[PDB]
Write a protein that binds this DNA or RNA. Structure first.
Ligand SMILES: Nc1ncnc2c1ncn2[C@@H]1O[C@H](COP(=O)(O)OP(=O)(O)OP(O)(O)=S)[C@@H](O)[C@H]1O
Ligand SMILES: Nc1ncnc2c1ncn2[C@@H]1O[C@H](COP(=O)(O)OP(=O)(O)OP(O)(O)=S)[C@@H](O)[C@H]1O
Ligand SMILES: Nc1ncnc2c1ncn2[C@@H]1O[C@H](COP(=O)(O)OP(=O)(O)OP(O)(O)=S)[C@@H](O)[C@H]1O
Ligand SMILES: Nc1ncnc2c1ncn2[C@@H]1O[C@H](COP(=O)(O)OP(=O)(O)OP(O)(O)=S)[C@@H](O)[C@H]1O
Lengths: 338, 317, 260, 315, 324, 260
DNA sequence: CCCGTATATT
DNA sequence: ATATACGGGCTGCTGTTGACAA
């Protein structure tokens, strides 16, 4: 985010006001169940959670007390984990520890449970967790439901196992449409000199998908590159997108084993720069499906879904990406000669 | 309390089914030629009970604690805790001057390779002061070196015919009124495991007061045979939506699971005449259905998919 | 409160317990006559003690006997918490209470104004063997001193695996043999010496024993003043010790081992 | 006393009814008395240890107690104490008449760590003028290359029917047990190579029956498993699911766990006479089914589905 | 305190369904011969509550320290703890009586939840533990899936399956709670809410509390329940089939992209599509193929796959079938 | 050093046996010549075992030293597929429709080759994945081989059952790579090629290590995997300076990949 | 496994 | 005219039990 023009009160919210009033009505009386917030990334769930905490308590939530903690595995091994947890509310992200998240959850939650008349314990990014950690978290959140409440935040509520999902409420936040994004961009820029013509804001909103964070970042980046805006000024793109575009262009011009080795090396280099395999698969599918126009389009989609399931079931990405690439190449070669 | 361990046999003559093995064991005892045993089989057949009855018959009541070792999965079984204690046990000159010693090794499929090699050496070295007895369920977790010196005995699954009289005796012992269909349904709902035929009786009798086919089927939840036959008849002949509605209403009325329905449908599919290929199709799809019901999915969609996989192949033919 | 016991010289109990300490757990036995702590190992070796009611000053028991299992290392550490080297003139007092089944053991210690409180939760019991060694079938018996075998049993820890004990009326009256990597080592003890109080062996007896089982007898031999050796027809070995305290009382410790 | 598997042990070297070449060479070497260090390998139940002990006894005679060393797996074989004791025994001098030497036997040497073997290989090339080694094992891949690089490797083989029958006849004649030809054939069939197993089975059958008729042998328990699966695989080769399921049902009703059956299926499938495509697909399906069974979902329906998938390949 | 923790069953005569288990517990209370227990079934039927109530009304709140232990999924269970601690507890002796003179049962209870998350090595020790010590201890295992438990563990325990609750019982209990808390319910809103809850007591209670706190104490209709639960509108869901029936791949992709943009969970979309499929005017073969594809997609989503690609695959298969 | 050549060992063994023969003493059967090269064939250039086997055999083959197969030789053996000309036998054939899967007879057992190299299966599969592309001439066979490799990968993705089933993966991968090569597998169709080509090492290790270290360098330093998946795109679209010295280098590291 | 080259020897 | 050696590519990415040097 930009973190400079972000509101800190349930009022004066640019979109999604009715659910805000419902949340205020719930928070104004205590007697809370556990909360689970979900929705597409870039919708602004964290702002809602922080404002709910601000309404529940006083103004003592605007302080930063970044803290470190070292705990021990059963044998000797040590885990260092950092929490932004300020007064009252505790915030943790048990994903920085790969397979120490279970013990992190156990120890930290059981220590804070004994430590309004209640606290909260945020657990950001509950998607990427194992199965035992969720079990322990569920049991400890059911046992001590008298002095601390849990507000989990995530997207794509499918990874969380049903017992947790059937143990708390579910609040959903959708993407903020298109016109609302252009309006908020226009007001945030007009607050700080110059302005955005309607066409430019609409183009930025369309090209920035549903994420207001990405739209704001792109607008600020374009503002530092050229001060006077025009009606035909493009937006800079990242270096991991043009690389994928070039790889997809080269993956269809020729179908030979040497080209396969070249694209395999390209995938290696792209993976080196910290891009997860899932985004690689999605971008490759978009670029490949840009021009199929036939039954091969559906076959490619089904094979890609198969390969995605394979990747999230296995433990080596390159095998599955190379297999999908080879199958697409063979299908395209067969279609071209017929 | 807890009938299953309240009526455990205390002698060799109060068992059933296997008779040749028991007579051979008695002959072994009479001639004092007891070899090392490797008793294996499926759960609930009478292995530990038989070995304990043999132990109680061999020794007196005041010697069972000073001449018998017992090692189970709840104890410690490594190398040092076997290399020391059992070597010293065979280094013990016998007290009471009568007979030899026994080391019962229950759940023998839990030790590691090194322990089993040391145990092979221990058992082979000195066959005059100790006689090991292994009891296992899987024969793939025992090293072949230790598998070639102990008399292998197989305890197969039990059969209803000789299984009935012990249940009759248990019923007579307490004050329980029993019927004919009740006994048959009680015996049938146990795949040779006697412990699943003695605990169901206690659970049922303490909830209603009398035992009958309907009583036990309501206590457990197993679908009836006529129910499965009606379901199959609805599958093979009628349409899609009508069959879906009928089985949905039947399952909603009496809450039924999906595993038992699949098992009974499998048996009935193999019992009817089919032209080969359709049978292969049904078996494959039903195996996939059963596998898919252990991850956390929804039962209604699985039932719909079972209906869909069963319908078309038979409807076309 | 079942049993409560108070004393002003912890050292007697501490040394009695240390004379038998080679396992980790122990079983107690409280009776109108006193306590009896026993320990067993390998289902062959068994060591027992005895602390009669004469030593105690405040001893109270209720109804029948009381049995419980206690960790020996923790108890021995707790008893000697004020330093195992007091100058002459300094003493420590202790009080212990056990309030029936399902509750821990209390221990309040005091010395010179310093007061300590500790608790030991007990999870009992185990089963003990029936090593009856009544003096009816005993064939060979001997009684002898300790300073003779201080170095002898100190010169007994090598890499061997079996210790041979032979006793006969003639020639090797009491001979110990140890076969190791280097060679044999005999330690013959004759009669009519300063450590031969009674020799009454009847028939020759040669036996083999395990070093691992018989090793922990060094602690009992060190804190002693006399040792009695007994062996029966079969070949079971019984060792009887005699320990004394500062006041001038006598307590006994017994060891039972079985031959190979 | 002892059972029949440990009481009828040969004391000489010509009672062994195993291989014919190595035993004769060992008898010649015992006659001469200049044996090098040897390493014996082979299936269990043959008599390797018996041969080694008989050779040592023949070599030494009355001085066996104070000139022989034997080490096992129950006895600790680390590095420190074992190397110390081995060097004591090698450096110690003893008197032997003409060509007899000191013998060190290490039974089941495959259990030793790399450090023990690497410390041992130095002592086995210097004191050769007064001592010699002899090793017995089951898996010969465990012993490192340098130790094998100076030893004579003798490899045994599974016993055939003729010698087994001859020694069984000798035992029967000794014990005066009325017999019958088909019963002895059945006992040999149940033996499957190993000999102590055959003797134990015969004793168990004779325990409380008094006859070795085939019906008595099968009644008193046992029965060999793999040959049933061998026919089942052939049946699924020809797309005969109906005939294939019968043997599976019989085995399941017999009381065998899914893992035990599925392992034998793979083991029999590897050493078979089929094509390449079929072998590949069969291995793939067996692997997937084994993963499913190991995950916990084991029943009759999974095995039936595996059979259906195997039969689908050939159509 | 939330309504879930306030109306927790404190007695056996508070569980609604499950007649056989409550009858067995009542008979074993004023008597003896209580066997081992193994509870399993779907969530929100009540398993911990029943055993906790039985333990509370068998011993008393003042006799819980030395009579019952509970080993949850937050206790770091392994082979060592099962070998030492459980054996040490089970090897103790029954203590005395309670303050108020009442008959007492001479045994203790060991409760362990989520036994399906343990390992086989610990389970072997556990199954051997409770055979020689069947005189003073009774074991109550609780699990969701029986398949994740070894055979000898489930071959010595009474298996009790907990059925998912019925409509009338849930409606009566919800009416009782609503009358207790003075909230005005509508006869149609409750009939819609019980359908939405798909047979969950805790979910229904939380839904009622969230609705009554949102409305403030006024009449609540079905529209509030749809918004709170999040049911996809039928007008939007008809568009998926309208696009898949004929047209092109681009329109299908755009429709699915908008649907996933709005944030709806794919499980609800699959559940609602299944209901429409089996009630339309379609041939049997097409219905069979679509149902099998739906089951496969549901399982793959349950195994942590992606959301966009699976919806695209299902919609492409539907497009292939509907144009044939 | 290198193993001794056959001629040198042959001449030395002949000299030794001649010396033994000239000793006379008795009528002893000289070992046959036909077994004398057999003795040297199964020893792999090692004098000491050859002399030991000669001594053993001359008492009146022996010396089967195990082979190690030199892993880079095993890879070539798998990847070259020495085939035969389909000698007339009774091997099963594909009846009617599998006419495109007919293959010539094979003279290698992949399981023994993989076992004898003394390597873990997950490493053998990685080496095969690295080195199998260059030997292929068609695309469809590459597709089939890639699918087989992926399926072999799937079977080992857990942790509790990773070592219970590992032979399946290696066997499937080896047989798939071997059988999928239909261009090479037609007996007398290997003329001519197979130039002087060296193998290589998998490149996945360095990439994985770089991924892990970059994971840590992204976490602990923007900790208030998802950061690399979501926050690191923002970092890639950040490109603005900040207050540090060692962090600008990291910013310029990820975001400067080569692109025209 | 693969191809081509420089030295001892008959 | 035939047997033998150089040249180029490898150390590498959660739990429960056991041995070694101090
Ligand atoms: N009502 C609002 N008015 C103006 N800007 C807003 C509003 N809500 C959110 N934003 C902006 O949205 C950005 C933050 O997005 P968030 O909604 O917090 O993403 P998020 O909630 O963190 O999602 P995840 O799950 O953490 S990736 C900042 O740039 C805020 O300024
Ligand atoms: N054939 C039988 N005859 C008599 N009682 C039996 C028989 N089978 C089972 N039982 C009873 O059922 C109880 C439970 O069976 P167990 O003998 O404990 O099972 P098991 O043979 O030990 O196999 P495990 O323990 O699952 S490996 C026994 O204690 C007996 O009381
Ligand atoms: N070749 C043989 N001739 C006669 N009896 C044999 C032979 N091989 C094995 N036996 C019998 O096997 C019994 C015990 O076998 P062992 O010789 O101890 O087995 P082993 O050679 O030590 O191999 P292991 O220890 O099982 S790997 C003896 O009592 C013999 O009766
Ligand atoms: N059968 C029932 N009878 C009465 N109230 C019930 C029943 N099931 C659930 N409830 C209500 O829902 C609450 C939650 O019940 P729990 O016992 O925590 O559920 P559970 O047994 O833990 O099942 P889980 O947690 O989903 S595995 C109880 O406190 C009751 O208010």
């Amino acid at each position: 985010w930009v973190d400079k023009y972000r509101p800190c009160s349930l009022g004066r919210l640019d979109y999604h006001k009715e659910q805000a009033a419902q949340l205020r009505n719930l928070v104004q009386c205590g007697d809370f169940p556990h909360l689970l917030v979900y929705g597409p990334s870039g919708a602004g769930k964290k702002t809602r959670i922080m404002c709910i905490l601000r309404e529940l308590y006083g103004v003592g939530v605007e302080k930063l007390r970044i803290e470190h903690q070292t705990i021990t595995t059963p044998s000797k091994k040590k885990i260092e984990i950092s929490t932004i947890a300020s007064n009252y509310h505790l915030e943790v992200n048990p994903s920085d520890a790969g397979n120490s998240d279970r013990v992190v959850i156990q120890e930290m939650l059981k220590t804070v449970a004994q430590s309004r008349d209640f606290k909260v314990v945020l657990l950001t990014e509950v998607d990427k967790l194992t199965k035992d950690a969720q079990h322990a978290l569920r049991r400890t959140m059911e046992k001590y439901m008298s002095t601390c409440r849990l507000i989990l935040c995530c997207n794509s509520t499918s990874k969380v196992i049903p017992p947790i999902r059937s143990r708390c409420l579910a609040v959903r936040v959708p993407a903020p449409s298109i016109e609302d994004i252009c309006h908020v961009l226009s007001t945030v820029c007009k607050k700080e000199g110059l302005n955005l013509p309607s066409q430019l804001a609409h183009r930025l909103a369309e090209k920035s998908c549903r994420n207001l964070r990405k739209a704001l970042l792109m607008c600020e980046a374009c503002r530092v590159q050229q001060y006077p805006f025009t009606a035909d000024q493009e937006i800079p793109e990242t270096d991991w997108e043009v690389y994928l575009r070039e790889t997809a262009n080269a993956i269809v011009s020729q179908q030979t084993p040497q080209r396969l080795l070249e694209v395999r090396g390209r995938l290696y280099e792209l993976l080196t720069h910290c891009i997860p395999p899932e985004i690689i698969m999605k971008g490759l599918l978009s670029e490949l499906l840009h021009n199929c126009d036939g039954q091969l389009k559906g076959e490619v989609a089904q094979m890609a879904a198969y390969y995605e399931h394979r990747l999230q079931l296995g433990s080596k990405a390159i095998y599955h990406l190379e297999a999908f690439v080879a199958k697409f190449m063979a299908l395209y070669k067969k279609f071209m000669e017929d | 309390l807890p009938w299953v361990e309240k009526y455990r046999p205390q002698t060799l003559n109060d068992l059933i089914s296997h008779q040749d093995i028991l007579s051979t064991i008695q002959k072994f005892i009479n001639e004092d030629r007891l070899p090392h045993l490797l008793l294996y089989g499926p759960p609930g057949t009478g292995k530990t009970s038989t070995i304990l009855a043999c132990a109680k018959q061999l020794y007196k009541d005041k010697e069972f604690g000073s001449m018998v070792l017992e090692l189970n999965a709840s104890d410690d079984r490594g190398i040092d805790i076997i290399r020391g204690p059992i070597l010293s046990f065979a280094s013990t000159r016998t007290i009471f001057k009568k007979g030899f010693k026994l080391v019962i090794l229950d759940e023998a499929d839990a030790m590691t390779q090194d322990a089993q090699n040391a145990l092979r050496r221990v058992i082979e070295k000195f066959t005059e002061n100790t006689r090991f007895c292994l009891i296992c369920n899987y024969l793939s977790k025992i090293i072949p070196a230790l598998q070639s010196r102990c008399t292998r005995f197989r305890f197969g699954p039990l059969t209803p015919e000789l299984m009935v009289p012990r249940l009759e005796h248990v019923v007579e012992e307490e004050k329980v009124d029993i019927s004919e269909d009740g006994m048959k349904a009680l015996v049938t709902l146990s795949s040779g495991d006697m412990r699943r035929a003695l605990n169901i009786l206690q659970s049922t009798n303490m909830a209603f007061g009398k035992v009958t086919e309907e009583t036990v089927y309501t206590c457990t939840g197993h679908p009836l045979k006529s129910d499965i036959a009606n379901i199959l008849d609805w599958m093979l002949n009628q349409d899609f939506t009508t069959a879906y509605r009928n089985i949905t209403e039947l399952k909603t009325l009496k809450g039924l699971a999906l595993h038992d329905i699949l098992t009974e449908i499998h048996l009935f599919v193999h019992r009817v005449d089919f032209p080969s290929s359709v049978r292969i199709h049904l078996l494959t799809k039903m195996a996939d259905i059963e596998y898919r019901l252990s991850v956390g999915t929804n039962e209604k969609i699985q039932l719909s998919s079972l209906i869909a996989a069963f319908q078309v192949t038979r409807d076309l033919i | 409160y079942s049993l409560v016991a108070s004393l002003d010289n912890v050292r007697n109990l501490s040394t009695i317990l240390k004379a038998i300490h080679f396992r980790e757990h122990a079983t107690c036995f409280a009776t109108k006559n006193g306590i009896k702590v026993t320990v067993e190992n390998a289902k062959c070796v068994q060591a027992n003690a005895f602390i009669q009611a004469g030593i105690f000053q405040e001893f109270k028991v209720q109804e029948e006997s009381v049995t419980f299992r206690i960790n020996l290392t923790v108890l021995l550490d707790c008893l000697s918490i004020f330093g195992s080297s007091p100058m002459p003139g300094t003493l420590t007092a202790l009080r212990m209470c056990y309030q029936g089944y399902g509750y821990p053991l209390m221990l309040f210690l005091e010395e010179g104004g310093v007061v300590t409180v500790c608790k030991i939760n007990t999870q009992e019991p185990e089963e003990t063997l029936d090593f009856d060694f009544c003096s009816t079938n005993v064939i060979n018996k001997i009684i002898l001193q300790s300073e003779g075998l201080r170095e002898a049993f100190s010169e007994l820890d090598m890499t061997s695996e079996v210790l041979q004990i032979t006793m006969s009326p003639d020639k090797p009256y009491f001979r110990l043999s140890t076969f190791g990597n280097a060679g044999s080592s005999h330690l013959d003890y004759p009669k009519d010496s300063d450590l031969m109080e009674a020799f009454h062996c009847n028939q020759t007896q040669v036996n083999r024993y395990k070093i691992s089982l018989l090793k922990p007898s060094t602690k009992a031999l060190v804190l002693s003043c006399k040792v009695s050796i007994r062996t029966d027809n079969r070949g079971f070995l019984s060792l009887q010790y005699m320990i004394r305290n500062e006041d001038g009382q006598i307590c006994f410790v017994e060891y039972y081992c079985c031959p190979d | 006393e002892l059972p029949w598997v440990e009481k009828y042990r040969p004391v000489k070297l010509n009672e062994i009814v195993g291989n014919e070449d190595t035993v004769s060479r060992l008898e010649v070497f015992a006659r001469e008395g200049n044996v090098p260090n040897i390493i014996i390998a082979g299936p269990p139940g043959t008599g390797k240890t018996t041969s080694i002990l008989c050779l040592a006894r023949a070599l030494l005679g009355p001085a066996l107690k104070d000139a022989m060393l034997e080490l096992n797996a129950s006895n600790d074989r680390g590095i420190d104490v074992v190397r110390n004791k081995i060097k004591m025994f090698a450096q110690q001098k003893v008197t032997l008449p003409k060509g007899r030497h000191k013998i060190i036997i290490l039974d089941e040497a495959d259990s030793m760590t790399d450090g023990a073997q690497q410390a041992l290989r130095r002592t086995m090339e210097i004191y050769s003028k007064t001592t010699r080694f002899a090793l017995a094992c089951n898996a010969s891949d465990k012993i490192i290359e340098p130790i094998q690089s100076r030893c004579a490797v003798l490899r045994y083989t599974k016993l055939t029917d003729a010698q087994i029958l001859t020694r069984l006849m000798n035992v029967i004649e000794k014990e005066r047990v009325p017999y019958t030809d088909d019963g002895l054939e059945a006992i040999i069939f149940t033996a499957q190579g190993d000999m102590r197993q055959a003797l134990n089975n015969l004793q168990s059958t004779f325990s409380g029956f008094g006859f070795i008729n085939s019906e008595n042998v099968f009644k008193v328990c046992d029965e060999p498993h793999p040959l049933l699966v061998k026919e089942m695989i052939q049946h699924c080769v020809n797309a005969n699911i109906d005939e294939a399921y019968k043997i599976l049902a019989h085995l399941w009703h017999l009381g065998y766990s899914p893992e035990d059956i599925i392992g034998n299926i793979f083991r029999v499938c590897k050493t078979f006479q089929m094509a390449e495509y079929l072998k590949l697909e069969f291995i793939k399906e067996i692997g997937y089914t084994h993963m499913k069974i190991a995950e916990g979902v084991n029943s009759l329906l999974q095995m039936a589905g595996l059979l259906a998938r195997l039969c689908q390949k050939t159509m | 305190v939330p309504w879930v923790e306030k109306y927790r069953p404190k007695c056996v005569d508070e569980v609604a369904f499950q007649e056989e288990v409550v009858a067995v517990l009542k008979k074993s209370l004023e008597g003896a011969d209580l066997p081992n227990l193994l509870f399993y079934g779907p969530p929100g039927t009540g398993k911990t509550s029943t055993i906790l109530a039985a333990a509370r009304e068998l011993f008393g709140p003042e006799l819980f320290r030395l009579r019952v232990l509970e080993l949850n999924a937050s206790d770091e269970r392994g082979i060592q703890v099962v070998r030492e601690k459980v054996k040490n507890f089970a090897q103790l002796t029954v203590s005395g009586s309670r303050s108020d003179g009442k008959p007492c049962p001479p045994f203790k209870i060991v409760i362990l939840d989520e036994a399906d998350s343990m390992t086989s090595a610990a389970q072997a020790a556990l199954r051997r533990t409770m055979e020689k010590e069947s005189k003073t201890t009774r074991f109550c295992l609780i699990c969701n899936y029986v398949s994740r438990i070894i055979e000898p563990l489930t071959s010595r325990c009474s298996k009790f399956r907990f059925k998912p609750l019925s409509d009338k019982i849930q409606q009566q209990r919800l009416l009782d709670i609503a009358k207790k808390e003075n909230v005005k319910i509508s006869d149609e809103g409750i009939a819609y809410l019980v359908k939405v809850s798909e047979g969950d007591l805790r979910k229904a209670i939380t839904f009622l509390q969230s609705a009554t706190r949102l409305t403030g104490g006024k009449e609540i209709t079905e529209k509030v329940i749809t918004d709170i639960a999040g049911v996809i509108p039928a007008e939007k869901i008809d568009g998926v089939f309208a696009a898949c029936q004929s047209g092109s791949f681009d329109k299908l992709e755009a429709v699915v992209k908008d649907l996933i943009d709005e944030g709806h969970a794919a499980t609800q979309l699959v559940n609602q599509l299944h209901d429409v499929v089996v009630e339309n005017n379609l041939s049997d073969k097409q219905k069979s193929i679509i149902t099998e594809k739906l089951a496969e997609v549901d399982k793959c989503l349950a195994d942590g796959a992606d959301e966009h690609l699976q919806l695209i695959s299902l919609c492409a298969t539907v497009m292939q079938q509907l144009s044939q | 050093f290198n193993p001794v050549a056959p001629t040198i060992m042959m001449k030395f063994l002949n000299r030794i046996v001649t010396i033994e023969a000239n000793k006379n003493g008795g009528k002893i059967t000289v070992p046959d010549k036909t077994s004398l090269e057999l003795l040297c064939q199964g020893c792999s250039g090692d004098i000491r075992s050859a002399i030991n086997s000669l001594q053993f055999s001359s008492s009146k083959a022996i010396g089967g030293k195990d082979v190690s197969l030199f892993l880079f030789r095993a890879l070539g053996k798998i990847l070259y597929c020495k085939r035969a000309s389909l000698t007339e036998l009774d091997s099963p054939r594909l009846p009617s429709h599998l006419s495109e899967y007919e293959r010539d007879t094979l003279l290698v057992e992949p399981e023994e080759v993989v076992e004898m190299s003394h390597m873990p299966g997950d490493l053998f599969n990685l080496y095969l994945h690295q080195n199998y592309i260059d030997f292929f001439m068609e695309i469809d066979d590459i597709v089939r081989a890639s699918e087989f490799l992926s399926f072999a990968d799937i079977l080992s993705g857990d942790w509790n059952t990773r070592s219970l089933l590992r032979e399946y993966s290696t066997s499937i991968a080896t047989r798939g790579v071997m059988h999928s090569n239909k261009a090479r597998g037609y007996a007398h169709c290997q003329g001519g090629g197979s130039s002087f080509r060296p193998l290589h090492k998998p490149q996945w290790f360095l990439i994985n290590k770089k991924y892990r270290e970059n994971c840590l360098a992204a976490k602990a330093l923007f900790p208030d995997l998802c950061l690399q998946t979501q926050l690191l795109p923002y970092l890639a679209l950040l490109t603005i300076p900040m207050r540090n010295q060692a962090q600008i280098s990291f910013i310029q590291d990820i975001g400067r990949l080569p692109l025209k």
